[PDB]
Amino acid sequence: EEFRPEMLQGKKVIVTGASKGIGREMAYHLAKMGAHVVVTARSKETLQKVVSHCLELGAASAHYIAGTMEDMTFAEQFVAQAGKLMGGLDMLILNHITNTSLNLFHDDIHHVRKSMEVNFLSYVVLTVAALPMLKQSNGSIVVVSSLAGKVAYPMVAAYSASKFALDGFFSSIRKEYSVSRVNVSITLCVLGLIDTETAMKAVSGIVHMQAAPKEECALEIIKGGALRQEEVYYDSSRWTTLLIRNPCRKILEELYSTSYNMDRF
Amino acid sequence: EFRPEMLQGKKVIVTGASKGIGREMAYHLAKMGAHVVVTARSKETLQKVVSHCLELGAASAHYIAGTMEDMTFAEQFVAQAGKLMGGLDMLILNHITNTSLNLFHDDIHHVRKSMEVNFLSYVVLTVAALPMLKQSNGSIVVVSSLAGKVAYPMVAAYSASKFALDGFFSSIRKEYSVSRVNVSITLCVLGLIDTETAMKAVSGIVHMQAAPKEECALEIIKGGALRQEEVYYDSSRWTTLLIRNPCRKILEELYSTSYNMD
Ligand SMILES: NC(=O)c1ccc[n+]([C@@H]2O[C@H](COP(=O)([O-])OP(=O)(O)OC[C@H]3O[C@@H](n4cnc5c(N)ncnc54)[C@H](OP(=O)(O)O)[C@@H]3O)[C@@H](O)[C@H]2O)c1
Numbered sequence: 444e445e446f447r448p449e450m451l452q453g454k455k456v457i458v459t460g461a462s463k464g465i466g467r468e469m470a471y472h473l474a475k476m477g478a479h480v481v482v483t484a485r486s487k488e489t490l491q492k493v494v495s496h497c498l499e500l501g502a503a504s505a506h507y508i509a510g511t512m513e514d515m516t517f518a519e520q521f522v523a524q525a526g527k528l529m530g531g532l533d534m535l536i537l538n539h540i541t542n543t544s545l546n547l548f549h550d551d552i553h554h555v556r557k558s559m560e561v562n563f564l565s566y567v568v569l570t571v572a573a574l575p576m577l578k579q580s581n582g583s584i585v586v587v588s589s590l591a592g593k594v595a596y597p598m599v600a601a602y603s604a605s606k607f608a609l610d611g612f613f614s615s616i617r618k619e620y621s622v623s624r625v626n627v628s629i630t631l632c633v634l635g636l637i638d639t640e641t642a643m644k645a646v647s648g649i650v651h652m653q654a655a656p657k658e659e660c661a662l663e664i665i666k667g668g669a670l671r672q673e674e675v676y677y678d679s680s681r682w683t684t685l686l687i688r689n690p691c692r693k694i695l696e697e698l699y700s701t702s703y704n705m706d707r708f
Numbered sequence: 709e710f711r712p713e714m715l716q717g718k719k720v721i722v723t724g725a726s727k728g729i730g731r732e733m734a735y736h737l738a739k740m741g742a743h744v745v746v747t748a749r750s751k752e753t754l755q756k757v758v759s760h761c762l763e764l765g766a767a768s769a770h771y772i773a774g775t776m777e778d779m780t781f782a783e784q785f786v787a788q789a790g791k792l793m794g795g796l797d798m799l800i801l802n803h804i805t806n807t808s809l810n811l812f813h814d815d816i817h818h819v820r821k822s823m824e825v826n827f828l829s830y831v832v833l834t835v836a837a838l839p840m841l842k843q844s845n846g847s848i849v850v851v852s853s854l855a856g857k858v859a860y861p862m863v864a865a866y867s868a869s870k871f872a873l874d875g876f877f878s879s880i881r882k883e884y885s886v887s888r889v890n891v892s893i894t895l896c897v898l899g900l901i902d903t904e905t906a907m908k909a910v911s912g913i914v915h916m917q918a919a920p921k922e923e924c925a926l927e928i929i930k931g932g933a934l935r936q937e938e939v940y941y942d943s944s945r946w947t948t949l950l951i952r953n954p955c956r957k958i959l960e961e962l963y964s965t966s967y968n969m970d
């Protein structure tokens with residue numbers, strides 16, 4: 444139950460949206476731990492800089508494959524390519540998101556659809572492609588979410604929708620993996636305000652709250668994934684840690700788990 | 709306290725109203741003397757509902773058949789329904805893409821179609837209905853599931869869109885509160901209902917007590933009319949007890965102080 448950096452030594456890990464912010468910080472922590480890494484985002488130049496520094500930090504191997512997660516064909520092929528480079532896969536870290544600003548919802552259906560496609564559907568496409576390799580290694584799926592993916596906030600309607608969707612989908616397949624004895628863990632990471640450049644610019648003059656450090660955030664995600672934890676909670680406030688968990692949800696899920704006859708599947 | 713006279717002369721849209729809970733809602737609204745415009749894909753099933761809704765005492769009853777896979781249809785339907793009624797007081801979003809209980813393997817088409825029909829069309833229908841609802845200080849009623857609050861196996865794609873329904877509509881409710889838009893949003897969290905499609909879907913997979921569709925449809929309407937944020941409807945006493953998240957509302961209240969909305 445206690446974490447050690449040696450747990451990630453020689454592990455074959457994918458980090459999406461790893462050119463900046465939390466994703467890059469995760470690549471850096473994995474490198475130091477002596478893991479095999481394959482990073483992705485759209486910018487080739489930004490990913491080149493992460494691979495170079497990953498090798499310097501002591502990564503067992505570091506590679507990149509640039510491309511958009513709007514392209515479900517790219518998302519699918521990226522996983523077959525990344526597992527080929529590493530000789531398999533132990534951990535899939537799903538972190539990328541479509542660029543989003545704090546705004547009231549009026550009529551931007553294109554932004555609602557794009558948020559669902561990039562923040563949620565590509566995650567499903569990446570999971571389908573990664574599952575054969577993860578089944579073989581008894582691996583981990585790590586889903587980076589937000590507090591806006593557990594509670595309601597204004598100015599993020601489309602973003603909150605795609606984040607809530609991740610919880611619904613991945614919590615459902617976790618229950619399916621439990622009964623169909625698929626030894627692949629699913630870690631949902633619920634994150635508060637992080638001091639990344641994009642987030643700090645987004646909240647500027649609108650939201651006034653304490654920002655947690657991105658370096659530590661990235662580590663707590665890796666920690667939970669390695670410990671095969673169902674959910675990881677990371678925020679500045681003490682109060683969030685105290686009230687974010689839903690004890691009644693897990694109790695309800697436990698009572699229903701007895702009633703679902705699936706010995707036909 | 710709910711009084712059926714609250715729905716008398718009200719201009720109401722019911723999606724997925726050819727059968728199940730949707731049809732039961734149309735029937736309750738008819739008895740209450742409301743103006744109704746029902747939708748689904750089957751013209752014949754809709755015709756039978758419109759006929760019986762006029763018989764029950766609806767102020768008016770109309771139907772517009774079409775698929776909610778088509779965002780152009782979803783947008784135009786609202787405009788057409790509003791023209792038929794001379795406005796809109798209540799938008800009941802109830803339709804879902806046909807879904808069976810199955811383990812997820814690779815059906816991305818079903819994940820995408822569930823998001824499009826079960827969630828995106830609801831957003832498209834809301835955007836089209838908001839000018840009319842702003843004018844009438846109306847209501848949006850979002851029919852969801854326990855599967856939109858807690859996790860269940862065999863319904864991954866369906867759960868995703870119901871969870872998304874919560875995230876989206878709970879977010880715009882907070883936005884409407886600050887931007888003083890007097891349009892209520894009712895999220896209806898339902899258990900197993902004795903509808904034909906649901907009873908066939910759970911057959912031999914999961915047996916538990918099924919709640920009556922007639923009463924279910926009424927509890928949704930009551931919720932919407934009382935402008936309640938959330939409606940909970942299930943058979944089990946243990947579900948009503950554990951389904952609510954008191955800590956979520958507390959957390960939302962504490963964060964509301966950290967932002968400026970002017
Ligand atoms: N920072 C916070 O305050 C905060 C709060 C709660 C939750 N989180 C969650 O944490 C995760 C990381 O956020 P972050 O703050 O680290 O973000 P960030 O610094 O803005 O980085 C976004 C990453 O995604 C990439 N990306 C953007 N558009 C993409 C697309 N179309 N396809 C593929 N990749 C794309 C970016 O690079 P390219 O543009 O080069 O592709 C970059 O690697 C997200 O899932 C976010 O929701 C963050």
Ligand SMILES: NC(=O)c1ccc[n+]([C@@H]2O[C@H](COP(=O)([O-])OP(=O)(O)OC[C@H]3O[C@@H](n4cnc5c(N)ncnc54)[C@H](OP(=O)(O)O)[C@@H]3O)[C@@H](O)[C@H]2O)c1
Pocket residue numbers: 723724725726727728729730747748749750753774775776777801802803804805806825851852853854898899900901902903904905906
């Ligand atoms: N019954 C339950 O056990 C249960 C449990 C939890 C939540 N709920 C929620 O309750 C609501 C109603 O469920 P129900 O059991 O009453 O369902 P139902 O009897 O299966 O009815 C579904 C309705 O939607 C229509 N529909 C289907 N596909 C459509 C499409 N592509 N475009 C437009 N309309 C479409 C159907 O008619 P056509 O085929 O003629 O188009 C029908 O009128 C749903 O939101 C469901 O999630 C039900």
Ligand SMILES: CC(C)(O)c1cccn2c(C3(c4ccc(Cl)cc4)CC3)nnc12
Pocket residue numbers: 543589590591596597598599602634635636641642643645646650967
């Ligand atoms: C990653 C992203 C989208 O750039 C981002 C930026 C800034 C804050 N973010 C948040 C929280 C939040 C805080 C306040 C409000 Cl009103 C809405 C949401 C939960 C902290 N989740 N994601 C983000």
Ligand SMILES: CC(C)(O)c1cccn2c(C3(c4ccc(Cl)cc4)CC3)nnc12
Pocket residue numbers: 703804807809853854855860861862863866898899900901905906907909910914
């Ligand atoms: C509307 C639909 C899709 O036909 C439907 C049918 C039957 C039950 N439904 C449920 C619940 C449930 C119960 C058990 C499991 Cl394993 C999954 C989900 C919450 C009751 N939500 N929607 C439905």
